[PDB]
Coordinates of C-alpha atoms and ligand atoms in Angstrom, one line a residue:
Chain A
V25 CA -22.5 -16.4 -0.1
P26 CA -19.1 -18.2 -0.2
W27 CA -16.5 -17.0 2.4
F28 CA -13.7 -14.9 1.0
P29 CA -10.7 -13.3 2.6
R30 CA -11.2 -9.7 3.6
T31 CA -7.6 -8.9 4.7
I32 CA -4.3 -9.9 3.1
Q33 CA -3.4 -12.0 6.2
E34 CA -6.6 -14.1 5.7
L35 CA -5.0 -15.7 2.6
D36 CA -3.3 -17.9 5.2
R37 CA -6.4 -20.1 5.3
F38 CA -5.7 -21.3 1.8
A39 CA -2.7 -23.4 2.8
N40 CA -5.0 -25.8 4.7
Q41 CA -7.3 -26.3 1.7
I42 CA -5.0 -27.6 -1.1
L43 CA -5.1 -30.9 -3.0
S44 CA -2.9 -33.0 -0.7
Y45 CA -2.2 -35.8 -3.1
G46 CA -0.2 -34.2 -5.9
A47 CA 1.0 -34.9 -9.4
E48 CA 4.4 -36.1 -8.3
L49 CA 2.6 -39.1 -6.8
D50 CA 1.3 -40.3 -10.2
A51 CA 2.9 -43.3 -12.0
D52 CA 3.5 -41.3 -15.2
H53 CA 5.2 -38.4 -13.5
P54 CA 8.7 -38.0 -14.9
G55 CA 10.0 -38.2 -11.3
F56 CA 7.8 -40.9 -9.9
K57 CA 10.4 -43.5 -9.4
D58 CA 12.9 -41.1 -7.9
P59 CA 12.7 -41.2 -4.1
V60 CA 15.1 -38.3 -3.8
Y61 CA 12.9 -36.2 -6.0
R62 CA 10.0 -37.3 -4.0
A63 CA 11.6 -36.1 -0.7
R64 CA 12.6 -32.8 -2.4
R65 CA 9.1 -32.1 -3.4
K66 CA 7.9 -32.8 0.1
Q67 CA 10.5 -30.4 1.5
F68 CA 9.2 -27.6 -0.8
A69 CA 5.6 -28.4 0.2
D70 CA 6.5 -28.2 3.9
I71 CA 8.0 -24.7 3.3
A72 CA 4.7 -23.6 1.8
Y73 CA 2.7 -25.3 4.5
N74 CA 4.5 -23.4 7.3
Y75 CA 4.6 -20.1 5.4
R76 CA 2.6 -17.2 6.9
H77 CA 1.8 -13.8 5.4
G78 CA 4.3 -11.2 6.4
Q79 CA 7.3 -13.6 6.6
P80 CA 10.2 -13.5 4.2
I81 CA 10.0 -16.6 1.8
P82 CA 12.7 -19.1 3.0
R83 CA 15.6 -19.3 0.6
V84 CA 16.7 -22.6 -0.6
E85 CA 20.0 -23.9 -1.8
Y86 CA 19.2 -25.6 -5.2
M87 CA 21.2 -28.6 -6.2
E88 CA 23.6 -28.6 -9.2
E89 CA 21.1 -30.9 -11.0
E90 CA 18.2 -28.5 -10.4
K91 CA 20.3 -25.6 -11.7
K92 CA 21.1 -27.6 -14.8
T93 CA 17.4 -28.2 -15.5
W94 CA 16.7 -24.5 -14.9
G95 CA 19.5 -23.5 -17.3
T96 CA 18.3 -25.7 -20.1
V97 CA 14.8 -24.2 -19.9
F98 CA 16.1 -20.7 -19.5
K99 CA 18.5 -20.7 -22.4
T100 CA 16.1 -22.5 -24.9
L101 CA 13.2 -20.1 -24.1
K102 CA 15.2 -16.9 -23.9
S103 CA 16.0 -17.3 -27.6
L104 CA 12.3 -16.6 -28.5
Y105 CA 11.4 -13.7 -26.3
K106 CA 12.7 -10.8 -28.3
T107 CA 10.6 -11.8 -31.3
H108 CA 7.6 -13.6 -29.7
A109 CA 7.0 -12.0 -26.3
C110 CA 5.1 -8.7 -25.7
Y111 CA 6.9 -5.4 -25.1
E112 CA 6.2 -5.5 -21.4
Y113 CA 7.9 -8.8 -21.1
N114 CA 11.1 -7.8 -22.9
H115 CA 11.1 -4.4 -21.2
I116 CA 11.4 -5.9 -17.7
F117 CA 13.5 -9.1 -18.4
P118 CA 16.9 -7.4 -18.4
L119 CA 16.1 -5.9 -15.0
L120 CA 15.1 -9.3 -13.7
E121 CA 18.5 -10.5 -14.9
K122 CA 20.3 -7.6 -13.3
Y123 CA 18.5 -7.4 -10.0
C124 CA 16.9 -10.9 -9.5
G125 CA 19.7 -13.2 -10.6
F126 CA 17.8 -14.5 -13.7
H127 CA 20.6 -16.3 -15.5
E128 CA 21.1 -19.9 -16.7
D129 CA 23.3 -20.9 -13.8
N130 CA 21.2 -19.6 -11.1
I131 CA 17.6 -20.2 -9.9
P132 CA 16.2 -17.0 -8.5
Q133 CA 15.0 -17.0 -4.9
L134 CA 11.3 -16.2 -4.5
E135 CA 12.0 -13.6 -1.7
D136 CA 14.1 -11.6 -4.1
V137 CA 11.6 -11.8 -6.9
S138 CA 8.8 -10.9 -4.5
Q139 CA 10.6 -7.7 -3.3
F140 CA 11.2 -6.8 -6.9
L141 CA 7.6 -7.2 -7.9
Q142 CA 6.6 -5.2 -4.9
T143 CA 8.6 -2.3 -6.1
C144 CA 7.1 -2.5 -9.5
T145 CA 3.4 -2.9 -8.9
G146 CA 2.7 -4.0 -5.3
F147 CA 2.5 -7.6 -6.4
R148 CA 4.0 -10.1 -4.0
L149 CA 4.6 -13.9 -4.0
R150 CA 3.5 -16.6 -1.5
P151 CA 5.0 -20.1 -1.9
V152 CA 2.5 -22.7 -2.7
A153 CA 2.9 -26.5 -2.6
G154 CA 0.2 -28.0 -4.5
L155 CA -3.1 -27.2 -6.3
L156 CA -5.3 -24.4 -5.0
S157 CA -9.0 -24.3 -5.9
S158 CA -9.8 -21.8 -8.6
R159 CA -11.7 -19.7 -6.0
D160 CA -8.7 -19.5 -3.7
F161 CA -6.1 -18.9 -6.4
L162 CA -8.1 -16.1 -8.0
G163 CA -8.9 -14.5 -4.7
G164 CA -5.2 -14.0 -3.9
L165 CA -5.0 -11.9 -7.1
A166 CA -7.5 -9.4 -5.5
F167 CA -4.7 -8.6 -3.1
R168 CA -2.0 -8.6 -5.8
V169 CA -0.8 -11.8 -4.3
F170 CA 0.5 -14.6 -6.6
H171 CA 0.8 -18.1 -5.2
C172 CA 4.0 -19.4 -6.7
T173 CA 5.7 -22.9 -6.7
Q174 CA 9.3 -23.2 -5.5
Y175 CA 9.9 -26.7 -6.7
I176 CA 11.4 -27.6 -10.1
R177 CA 10.4 -30.2 -12.6
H178 CA 12.3 -33.6 -12.7
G179 CA 15.7 -33.2 -14.5
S180 CA 15.1 -36.3 -16.7
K181 CA 12.7 -34.3 -18.9
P182 CA 13.8 -30.7 -18.7
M183 CA 11.6 -29.5 -21.6
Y184 CA 8.5 -31.0 -20.1
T185 CA 6.3 -30.4 -17.1
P186 CA 2.8 -31.7 -16.4
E187 CA 2.4 -28.9 -13.8
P188 CA 3.4 -25.4 -12.9
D189 CA 7.0 -25.5 -11.6
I190 CA 9.4 -22.7 -10.7
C191 CA 10.5 -22.3 -14.4
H192 CA 6.9 -21.7 -15.4
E193 CA 6.2 -19.2 -12.7
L194 CA 9.4 -17.2 -13.1
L195 CA 9.7 -17.2 -16.9
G196 CA 6.0 -17.3 -17.6
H197 CA 4.1 -15.4 -14.9
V198 CA 6.5 -13.1 -13.1
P199 CA 7.6 -10.7 -15.9
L200 CA 4.0 -9.7 -16.6
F201 CA 3.3 -8.9 -13.0
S202 CA 6.0 -6.2 -13.2
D203 CA 3.7 -4.2 -15.5
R204 CA 1.1 -1.9 -13.9
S205 CA -1.6 -2.4 -16.5
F206 CA -1.3 -6.1 -16.4
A207 CA -1.3 -6.1 -12.6
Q208 CA -4.5 -4.1 -12.6
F209 CA -6.1 -6.4 -15.2
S210 CA -5.2 -9.6 -13.2
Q211 CA -6.3 -8.0 -9.9
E212 CA -9.7 -7.3 -11.6
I213 CA -10.2 -11.0 -12.2
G214 CA -9.3 -11.6 -8.5
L215 CA -11.8 -9.0 -7.4
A216 CA -14.6 -10.4 -9.7
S217 CA -14.1 -13.8 -8.0
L218 CA -14.6 -12.8 -4.4
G219 CA -17.9 -14.4 -3.2
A220 CA -18.9 -15.3 -6.7
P221 CA -20.9 -18.4 -7.1
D222 CA -19.0 -21.5 -8.1
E223 CA -20.6 -21.3 -11.5
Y224 CA -19.1 -17.9 -12.2
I225 CA -15.8 -19.0 -10.7
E226 CA -15.5 -21.6 -13.5
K227 CA -16.2 -18.9 -16.0
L228 CA -13.6 -16.6 -14.5
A229 CA -11.1 -19.5 -14.5
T230 CA -11.8 -19.9 -18.2
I231 CA -11.3 -16.2 -18.9
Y232 CA -8.1 -16.6 -16.9
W233 CA -7.0 -19.5 -19.1
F234 CA -7.5 -17.5 -22.3
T235 CA -5.8 -14.4 -21.0
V236 CA -3.3 -14.8 -18.2
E237 CA -2.4 -18.3 -19.3
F238 CA -2.7 -18.4 -23.1
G239 CA -3.5 -14.9 -24.2
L240 CA -2.2 -13.0 -27.2
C241 CA -2.3 -9.2 -27.4
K242 CA -2.2 -6.6 -30.1
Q243 CA 1.0 -4.5 -30.2
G244 CA 1.1 -1.6 -32.7
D245 CA 0.1 -3.5 -35.9
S246 CA 1.5 -6.8 -34.7
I247 CA 0.4 -9.7 -32.2
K248 CA 2.6 -11.0 -29.4
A249 CA 2.3 -13.6 -26.6
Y250 CA 1.6 -12.6 -23.0
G251 CA 0.1 -15.8 -21.6
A252 CA 2.3 -17.5 -18.9
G253 CA 1.7 -21.0 -20.4
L254 CA 2.9 -19.7 -23.8
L255 CA 5.9 -17.9 -22.5
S256 CA 7.1 -20.9 -20.6
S257 CA 6.5 -23.3 -23.5
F258 CA 9.2 -23.4 -26.2
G259 CA 7.0 -25.3 -28.7
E260 CA 3.7 -23.5 -28.1
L261 CA 5.3 -20.0 -28.1
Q262 CA 6.5 -20.5 -31.6
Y263 CA 3.2 -22.2 -32.7
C264 CA 0.9 -19.5 -31.3
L265 CA 2.3 -16.9 -33.7
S266 CA 2.2 -19.1 -36.8
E267 CA -0.5 -19.6 -39.3
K268 CA -1.8 -22.7 -37.7
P269 CA -4.1 -21.7 -34.7
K270 CA -7.3 -19.8 -35.0
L271 CA -7.4 -16.3 -33.5
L272 CA -10.5 -14.5 -32.2
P273 CA -10.9 -11.1 -30.5
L274 CA -11.2 -11.3 -26.8
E275 CA -15.1 -11.2 -26.1
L276 CA -15.9 -12.4 -22.7
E277 CA -19.4 -13.7 -23.1
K278 CA -17.9 -16.1 -25.6
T279 CA -14.5 -16.6 -24.1
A280 CA -16.0 -17.4 -20.7
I281 CA -17.8 -20.5 -22.0
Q282 CA -15.1 -21.7 -24.5
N283 CA -13.9 -25.3 -23.9
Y284 CA -10.2 -26.1 -23.9
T285 CA -7.8 -29.0 -23.1
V286 CA -4.5 -28.8 -21.2
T287 CA -2.6 -31.6 -22.9
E288 CA -2.0 -30.3 -26.5
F289 CA -1.3 -26.9 -28.1
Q290 CA -4.5 -24.7 -28.0
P291 CA -6.3 -24.7 -31.4
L292 CA -7.8 -21.3 -30.6
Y293 CA -6.4 -18.1 -28.9
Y294 CA -8.2 -14.9 -27.9
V295 CA -6.5 -11.6 -28.8
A296 CA -6.7 -8.7 -26.3
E297 CA -6.6 -5.1 -27.6
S298 CA -4.6 -4.2 -24.6
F299 CA -4.4 -5.1 -20.9
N300 CA -6.5 -1.9 -20.1
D301 CA -9.2 -3.0 -22.5
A302 CA -9.2 -6.5 -21.1
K303 CA -9.5 -5.1 -17.6
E304 CA -12.5 -3.0 -18.7
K305 CA -14.1 -6.1 -20.2
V306 CA -13.5 -8.1 -16.9
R307 CA -15.0 -5.2 -14.9
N308 CA -18.1 -5.2 -17.1
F309 CA -18.4 -9.0 -17.0
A310 CA -18.0 -8.9 -13.2
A311 CA -21.1 -6.6 -12.9
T312 CA -23.1 -9.5 -14.4
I313 CA -22.1 -11.9 -11.6
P314 CA -24.9 -12.3 -9.0
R315 CA -23.4 -10.9 -5.9
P316 CA -25.4 -8.9 -3.3
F317 CA -22.4 -6.5 -2.8
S318 CA -19.6 -4.8 -4.6
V319 CA -15.9 -5.1 -3.6
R320 CA -12.9 -2.8 -3.6
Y321 CA -9.3 -3.4 -2.5
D322 CA -7.7 -0.8 -0.3
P323 CA -3.9 -1.0 -0.8
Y324 CA -3.4 1.5 2.1
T325 CA -4.8 -1.0 4.7
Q326 CA -4.6 -4.2 2.6
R327 CA -8.2 -4.9 3.2
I328 CA -11.2 -5.5 0.9
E329 CA -14.0 -3.1 1.4
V330 CA -17.4 -4.8 1.0
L331 CA -20.5 -2.7 0.2
Chain B
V19 CA 10.4 23.7 -10.4
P20 CA 11.2 22.9 -6.7
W21 CA 12.5 19.5 -5.9
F22 CA 10.0 17.1 -4.3
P23 CA 10.2 13.6 -3.0
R24 CA 9.0 11.0 -5.5
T25 CA 9.3 7.9 -3.3
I26 CA 8.4 7.5 0.4
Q27 CA 12.1 6.9 1.3
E28 CA 13.0 10.2 -0.1
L29 CA 11.3 11.9 2.9
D30 CA 14.6 11.1 4.6
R31 CA 16.1 14.3 3.0
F32 CA 13.9 16.5 5.3
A33 CA 15.7 15.7 8.5
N34 CA 18.8 17.6 7.2
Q35 CA 16.7 20.7 6.4
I36 CA 15.0 21.6 9.8
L37 CA 15.3 24.7 11.9
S38 CA 18.3 23.8 14.1
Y39 CA 17.9 26.5 16.7
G40 CA 14.5 25.6 18.3
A41 CA 12.0 27.1 20.6
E42 CA 13.4 25.5 23.8
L43 CA 16.5 27.8 23.3
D44 CA 14.4 30.9 23.9
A45 CA 14.5 32.9 27.1
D46 CA 10.8 32.8 27.5
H47 CA 10.4 29.1 27.0
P48 CA 8.8 27.4 30.1
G49 CA 11.8 25.1 30.3
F50 CA 14.6 27.5 29.3
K51 CA 16.4 27.5 32.7
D52 CA 16.1 23.7 33.1
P53 CA 19.3 22.0 31.9
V54 CA 17.8 18.6 32.4
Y55 CA 14.9 19.5 30.1
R56 CA 17.3 20.9 27.7
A57 CA 19.2 17.6 27.4
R58 CA 16.0 15.7 27.2
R59 CA 14.9 17.8 24.2
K60 CA 18.3 17.1 22.6
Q61 CA 17.9 13.5 23.1
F62 CA 14.5 13.4 21.3
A63 CA 16.0 15.5 18.5
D64 CA 18.8 13.0 18.1
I65 CA 16.3 10.2 17.8
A66 CA 14.6 12.0 15.0
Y67 CA 17.9 13.0 13.4
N68 CA 19.0 9.3 13.1
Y69 CA 15.6 8.0 12.1
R70 CA 15.3 6.5 8.6
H71 CA 12.2 5.4 6.7
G72 CA 11.4 1.8 7.2
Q73 CA 12.8 1.6 10.8
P74 CA 10.6 1.1 13.8
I75 CA 10.4 4.4 15.9
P76 CA 12.6 4.0 18.9
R77 CA 10.6 3.6 22.1
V78 CA 11.5 5.8 25.0
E79 CA 11.0 5.3 28.7
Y80 CA 9.2 8.5 29.9
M81 CA 10.0 9.9 33.3
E82 CA 7.4 10.1 36.1
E83 CA 7.4 13.9 35.7
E84 CA 6.7 13.6 32.0
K85 CA 3.8 11.2 32.6
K86 CA 2.4 13.5 35.2
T87 CA 2.3 16.3 32.6
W88 CA 0.7 14.1 30.1
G89 CA -1.9 12.9 32.5
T90 CA -2.9 16.5 33.4
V91 CA -3.4 17.4 29.8
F92 CA -5.2 14.2 29.0
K93 CA -7.7 14.3 31.8
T94 CA -8.5 17.9 31.4
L95 CA -9.1 17.7 27.6
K96 CA -10.9 14.4 27.7
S97 CA -13.7 16.0 29.5
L98 CA -14.7 18.0 26.5
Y99 CA -14.5 15.5 23.7
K100 CA -17.9 13.8 23.9
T101 CA -19.6 17.2 23.5
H102 CA -17.1 19.3 21.5
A103 CA -15.2 16.9 19.2
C104 CA -16.5 15.5 15.8
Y105 CA -17.9 12.0 15.6
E106 CA -14.8 10.6 13.9
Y107 CA -12.8 11.7 16.9
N108 CA -15.0 10.1 19.5
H109 CA -15.5 7.0 17.4
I110 CA -11.8 6.2 17.4
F111 CA -10.7 7.4 20.8
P112 CA -11.8 4.3 22.8
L113 CA -9.8 2.1 20.4
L114 CA -6.8 4.3 21.0
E115 CA -7.3 3.8 24.7
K116 CA -7.6 0.1 24.2
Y117 CA -4.9 -0.7 21.7
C118 CA -2.5 2.2 22.0
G119 CA -2.3 2.8 25.7
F120 CA -4.0 6.2 25.6
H121 CA -4.6 6.7 29.4
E122 CA -3.6 9.4 31.9
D123 CA -0.8 7.4 33.4
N124 CA 0.9 6.4 30.2
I125 CA 2.4 8.2 27.3
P126 CA 1.8 6.2 24.1
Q127 CA 4.8 5.2 22.1
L128 CA 4.9 6.5 18.5
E129 CA 5.7 3.1 17.1
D130 CA 2.5 1.6 18.5
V131 CA 0.5 4.6 17.3
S132 CA 2.0 4.4 13.9
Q133 CA 1.1 0.7 13.4
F134 CA -2.4 1.6 14.6
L135 CA -2.8 4.4 12.0
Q136 CA -1.4 2.1 9.3
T137 CA -4.2 -0.4 10.0
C138 CA -6.8 2.3 9.8
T139 CA -5.8 4.3 6.8
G140 CA -2.2 3.7 5.7
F141 CA -1.1 6.8 7.6
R142 CA 2.2 6.4 9.4
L143 CA 4.3 8.5 11.8
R144 CA 7.9 9.7 11.5
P145 CA 9.6 11.3 14.5
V146 CA 10.6 14.9 14.0
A147 CA 12.7 17.1 16.2
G148 CA 12.1 20.6 15.2
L149 CA 10.4 22.8 12.6
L150 CA 10.0 21.6 9.1
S151 CA 9.4 24.0 6.3
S152 CA 5.8 24.1 5.1
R153 CA 6.8 22.6 1.8
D154 CA 8.5 19.6 3.5
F155 CA 5.8 19.1 6.2
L156 CA 3.0 19.2 3.6
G157 CA 4.9 17.0 1.1
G158 CA 5.0 14.2 3.7
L159 CA 1.2 14.2 3.7
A160 CA 1.3 13.2 0.0
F161 CA 2.6 9.9 1.2
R162 CA 0.2 9.7 4.2
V163 CA 3.2 10.4 6.4
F164 CA 2.8 12.6 9.5
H165 CA 5.9 14.1 11.0
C166 CA 5.3 13.8 14.8
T167 CA 7.2 15.2 17.8
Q168 CA 8.1 12.8 20.6
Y169 CA 9.1 15.3 23.2
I170 CA 6.7 16.7 25.9
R171 CA 6.2 20.3 27.1
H172 CA 7.9 21.4 30.3
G173 CA 6.1 20.2 33.4
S174 CA 6.0 23.7 35.0
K175 CA 3.2 24.7 32.7
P176 CA 1.2 21.6 31.8
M177 CA -1.6 23.5 30.3
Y178 CA 0.6 25.6 28.0
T179 CA 2.8 24.9 25.0
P180 CA 4.4 27.4 22.6
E181 CA 5.0 24.5 20.2
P182 CA 3.6 21.2 19.0
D183 CA 4.5 18.6 21.6
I184 CA 3.5 15.0 21.9
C185 CA 0.3 15.9 23.7
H186 CA -0.7 18.0 20.7
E187 CA 0.2 15.4 18.2
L188 CA -1.5 12.5 20.0
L189 CA -4.6 14.1 21.3
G190 CA -5.0 16.7 18.5
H191 CA -3.8 15.2 15.2
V192 CA -3.7 11.4 15.5
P193 CA -7.4 10.6 16.0
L194 CA -8.4 12.3 12.8
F195 CA -5.8 10.4 10.8
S196 CA -7.6 7.2 11.7
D197 CA -10.5 8.3 9.5
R198 CA -10.5 7.5 5.8
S199 CA -12.2 10.6 4.6
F200 CA -9.9 12.8 6.7
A201 CA -6.9 10.9 5.6
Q202 CA -7.8 11.5 1.9
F203 CA -8.5 15.1 2.5
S204 CA -5.2 15.8 4.2
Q205 CA -3.3 13.8 1.6
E206 CA -4.9 16.0 -1.1
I207 CA -3.3 19.0 0.6
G208 CA 0.1 17.2 0.5
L209 CA -0.4 16.3 -3.2
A210 CA -1.3 19.9 -4.1
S211 CA 2.0 21.0 -2.5
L212 CA 4.4 18.9 -4.5
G213 CA 6.5 21.2 -6.8
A214 CA 4.1 24.1 -6.1
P215 CA 5.7 27.5 -6.1
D216 CA 6.5 29.0 -2.7
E217 CA 3.7 31.5 -3.2
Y218 CA 1.2 28.6 -3.4
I219 CA 2.8 26.7 -0.6
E220 CA 1.9 29.7 1.7
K221 CA -1.6 29.5 0.5
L222 CA -1.8 25.8 1.2
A223 CA -0.3 26.3 4.6
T224 CA -3.1 28.8 5.3
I225 CA -5.8 26.4 4.1
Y226 CA -4.1 23.9 6.4
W227 CA -4.3 26.2 9.3
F228 CA -8.0 26.8 8.8
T229 CA -8.8 23.1 8.3
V230 CA -6.4 20.6 9.8
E231 CA -5.4 22.9 12.5
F232 CA -8.4 25.1 13.4
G233 CA -11.2 23.7 11.4
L234 CA -14.9 23.2 12.4
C235 CA -17.2 20.9 10.5
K236 CA -20.9 20.4 10.0
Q237 CA -22.3 17.2 11.7
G238 CA -26.0 16.5 11.1
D239 CA -27.5 19.9 12.1
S240 CA -24.7 20.7 14.5
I241 CA -21.1 22.0 14.3
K242 CA -18.1 20.2 15.9
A243 CA -14.3 20.8 16.2
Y244 CA -11.9 18.7 14.1
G245 CA -8.8 21.0 14.0
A246 CA -5.7 19.6 15.9
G247 CA -5.0 22.9 17.6
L248 CA -8.6 23.1 18.9
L249 CA -8.7 19.5 20.1
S250 CA -5.5 19.9 22.1
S251 CA -6.5 23.3 23.6
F252 CA -8.8 23.2 26.6
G253 CA -9.6 26.9 26.4
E254 CA -10.0 27.3 22.7
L255 CA -12.0 24.1 22.2
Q256 CA -14.7 25.5 24.5
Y257 CA -14.5 28.9 22.9
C258 CA -14.7 27.8 19.3
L259 CA -18.3 26.4 19.8
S260 CA -19.5 29.5 21.8
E261 CA -21.2 32.6 20.5
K262 CA -18.0 34.6 20.5
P263 CA -16.1 33.7 17.3
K264 CA -17.2 34.5 13.8
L265 CA -17.9 31.4 11.6
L266 CA -17.8 31.4 7.7
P267 CA -18.2 28.5 5.2
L268 CA -15.0 27.0 4.0
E269 CA -14.3 28.8 0.6
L270 CA -10.8 28.3 -0.4
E271 CA -10.2 31.4 -2.6
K272 CA -11.0 33.4 0.6
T273 CA -9.7 31.0 3.2
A274 CA -6.3 30.8 1.4
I275 CA -5.5 34.5 1.8
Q276 CA -7.0 35.0 5.3
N277 CA -4.6 36.3 7.9
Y278 CA -4.3 34.8 11.3
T279 CA -2.1 34.9 14.4
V280 CA -0.8 32.0 16.6
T281 CA -0.8 33.6 20.0
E282 CA -4.5 34.2 20.8
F283 CA -7.8 32.3 20.2
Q284 CA -8.8 32.6 16.5
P285 CA -11.5 35.4 16.0
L286 CA -12.7 33.5 12.9
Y287 CA -13.2 29.8 11.9
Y288 CA -14.1 28.2 8.6
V289 CA -16.8 25.5 8.6
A290 CA -16.3 22.5 6.3
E291 CA -19.5 20.7 5.0
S292 CA -17.6 17.5 5.3
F293 CA -14.1 16.1 4.8
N294 CA -15.1 14.8 1.4
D295 CA -16.3 18.2 0.4
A296 CA -13.2 19.9 1.7
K297 CA -11.1 17.4 -0.2
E298 CA -13.0 18.2 -3.5
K299 CA -12.4 21.9 -2.8
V300 CA -8.7 21.3 -2.3
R301 CA -8.5 19.3 -5.5
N302 CA -10.2 22.1 -7.4
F303 CA -7.9 24.7 -5.8
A304 CA -4.8 22.6 -6.6
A305 CA -5.7 22.7 -10.4
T306 CA -5.3 26.4 -10.2
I307 CA -1.7 26.1 -9.0
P308 CA 0.8 26.7 -11.8
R309 CA 2.5 23.3 -12.2
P310 CA 3.7 21.9 -15.5
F311 CA 2.6 18.4 -14.4
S312 CA -0.1 16.5 -12.4
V313 CA 0.8 14.1 -9.6
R314 CA -0.7 11.0 -8.1
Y315 CA 0.4 8.8 -5.3
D316 CA 0.6 5.0 -5.9
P317 CA 0.1 3.2 -2.5
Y318 CA 1.1 -0.1 -4.1
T319 CA 4.7 1.1 -4.8
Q320 CA 4.7 4.1 -2.4
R321 CA 5.8 6.3 -5.3
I322 CA 4.5 9.5 -6.7
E323 CA 3.6 9.3 -10.4
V324 CA 4.4 12.5 -12.2
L325 CA 2.7 13.3 -15.6
Ligands
FE2_6 FE1 0.5 -20.6 -14.6
FE2_7 FE1 -0.4 20.5 14.8

């Protein structure tokens, strides 16, 4: 059985198991030829490298150029949320603006955002430099821990990123973690992953793609976006609620094996009835994963109980 | 409906609702004529007065005379535990000795004990000076918070205390809070209390007396003590497992209205089948309390959810 963390501090092992040779090193990265941007990325990676559970997340002073990039992404996306984002998103966004400094001329600091999520649902952030394995990323969710980038995309192409950057995490992921039902749903995926065989990890990663990253949900008689990758994509957020894509009900035996690509708009989305119903479905799917034990998180001690 | 705290920080209101004119002010208190002891008690009360949730509990340097008193109580009680105390007590006591400094020549500091309980079950301590109302004391349990004295009894009568002192809390109460089932059981009493009418508070206080304070429990085919007031009383701990007292099964419609006195050994004890069974019984009893809502603690946000 694969090793998995049993205490929240044990997530500290992940930082020495990331992909070391990251996207910003590629010839086609928007910032590839910018040595200043290169050094900035390395500085953020070093903060995540040295971070340890329990510490406050170091604050960073963002440059004017970084704030400009943030403000372009923020103001162009914000125009779609009232109409395209789910209720839970719009409900919390004004509080993020009031208490977390979410505004076009200011990049929120992860420590503030983390304390805010803690008050809402117990979720917390940890800074992460580069790409975690699916197993390690998902396992953090068991503890209501979200590994979060601190860096920003290159300012030459503000509307484009080949990777999660701080605009994706804060405008795409964070608002849903403020919701109890969504937090329980995403934690359920994390719990399903612990000690699961690699073959089932890939399936959970695919369910994750079609829910947390690109999911749509029913809302009264309508349909709204909740996936992080939709909420942080101006073009795909408008497309996903148009007549063009195909929609199917969330059905995890099907969703789990569905292929997808990361470089175009999704041709197909799965619709969740609700976050509670998705959570039930994940729980049922997880019972089908060959594991010689069952797992439960204890938030009082921040430990996983293994039976 | 009576006000009750809804967040763990809100327990801070209790400190300005205690009995201000305490037992040490009475002519028959063992330390009454000792002005040094008087000032020492006032110093501990001022620490509890100024304490605020979230802070570390101030450490105190205990005098040699205080440590002597502790060591007499500690060594005389410790001789009974292997035979008279429940398994959960004996299981945790060596770890308290190893990691909390529980030894005859050292009074443990509440901050260390609190961090230890947190790792075990989420329970924490808050220092308390004097007598809380039953409503406020019980309400803290809803949050897995135990209000704990820091002072010690007068050294003139080491085997006697007319009040809870630090020897009672640490040797009587603390070890049971290290057990998950016991923690869930005592929290259930706290939850039952929130917004309950005074008439039901008195009933819950009486159940508390006959369980947390003076309860006995079945253990395999035997019976053992778990009540704090037994575990910190050399004479009553031996008596309670002798032929002299009457024993009855824990039955809360009966137990809740049973009278008792605080100045002699109890003539009657109630036997719990287990802490889980006691917890179930408290939950059922609580549904009988007229409250126009139901309550649940969320350990992720440390808030009470009221429906
Ligand atoms: Fe993402
Ligand atoms: Fe007590």
